[PDB]
Design a protein around this ligand. Structure first.
Ligand SMILES: CCOP(O)(=S)OCC
Ligand SMILES: [Co+2]
Ligand SMILES: [Fe+2]
Length: 329
């Protein structure tokens, strides 16, 4: 008791986060896009309503908190997050950091300037809203670009100053987490402050246990993503991949069976609107996974339970691990 985490509706006790999905999005977009072209989503009101229905569904399934890891360049709209969080009665933790679509005004910045930006969003507030980020999101897609090196270092520095954790996008098949880990450790950041995300996009357990053994959190965060059935659709295939959700979920069991139950974070990487990809992609996603952010508690957790993962273990993964990760440390 007494540890707090910042949400888009203000501070909450860590012990009230409960069942937490640690990598999710209300809307995957671009900076300024929802303001300039809300009709792309039908309307802003249509997007918010869709998001409220989805989160209420997740809530009815036992989800109490999501971490929306949309950054500035994923077009994070913190007023939107606050509105849908209030309406659905689900906590939303917002993010600072940068993903892999930074505009030139970010790409021209130094490590010091990036550090100052991430600190502003954590310590002062995002935009003019007063809402504080509770996580820092970074990305590589292969070997880090020079700019991405700075971002990761700035993320380490902001995390060391504030205690707020860092979470990452990787190309998991290219094993990005190893260089990400090397950069974070070069800055003196503790591996227990760090989640290496999209780690279920690979079945390479040498790579995953290597990270887990060093104390990283392994983000198994794209549970419902499968394009099995959709080989007609090139963009759906590139996005979803060709592994079943059961294959992804088996990784959670695999890590638990190797002693790594406390190093695991589970999520969907779901969204309710998606403008940074092909048009109508949200109809394809909703057909593949009509349960949205309820998919983990409805499908994945019982799957694990039926494979013989004990309930206390499942609770530790979906409640205790996110609480520990999010508590500023
Ligand atoms: C399938 C979604 O991929 P990302 O987590 S990199 O986010 C796009 C908003
Ligand atoms: Co990502
Ligand atoms: Fe994501």
């Amino acid at each position: 008791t007494g540890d707090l985490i910042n949400t888009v509706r203000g501070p909450i006790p860590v012990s009230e986060a409960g069942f937490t999905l640690t990598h999710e999005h209300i809307c995957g977009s671009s900076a300024g896009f929802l303001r300039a072209w809300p009709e792309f989503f039908g309307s802003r009101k249509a997007l918010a309503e869709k998001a409220v229905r989805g989160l209420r569904h997740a809530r009815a399934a036992g989800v109490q908190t999501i971490v929306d890891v949309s950054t500035f360049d994923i077009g994070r709209d913190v007023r939107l997050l606050a509105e849908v969080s209030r309406a659905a009665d689900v906590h939303i933790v917002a993010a600072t950091g940068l993903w892999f679509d930074p505009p030139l005004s970010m790409r021209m910045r130094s490590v010091e300037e990036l550090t100052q930006f991430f600190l502003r969003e954590i310590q002062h507030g995002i935009e003019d809203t007063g809402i504080r980020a509770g996580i820092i999101k970074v990305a590589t897609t292969g070997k880090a670009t020079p700019f991405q090196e700075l971002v990761l270092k700035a993320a380490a520095r902001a995390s060391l100053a504030t205690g707020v954790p860092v979470t990452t996008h990787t190309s998991a098949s290219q094993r990005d987490g190893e260089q990400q880990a090397a950069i974070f450790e070069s800055e003196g950041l503790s591996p227990s402050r760090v989640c290496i995300g999209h780690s279920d996009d690979t079945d390479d357990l040498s790579y995953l246990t290597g990270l887990a053994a060093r104390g990283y959190l392994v983000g198994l965060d794209r549970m419902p993503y499968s394009a099995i059935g959709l080989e007609g659709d090139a963009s759906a295939l590139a996005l979803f991949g060709t592994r079943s959700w059961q294959t992804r979920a088996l990784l959670i069991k695999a890590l638990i069976d190797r002693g790594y139950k406390d190093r695991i974070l589970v999520s969907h990487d779901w969204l309710f609107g998606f403008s940074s990809y092909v048009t109508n992609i949200m109809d394809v996603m909703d057909r593949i996974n009509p349960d949205g952010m309820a998919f983990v508690p409805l499908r994945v957790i019982p799957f694990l339970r039926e494979k013989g993962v004990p309930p206390e273990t499942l609770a530790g993964v979906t409640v205790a691990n996110p609480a520990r990760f999010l508590s500023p440390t």
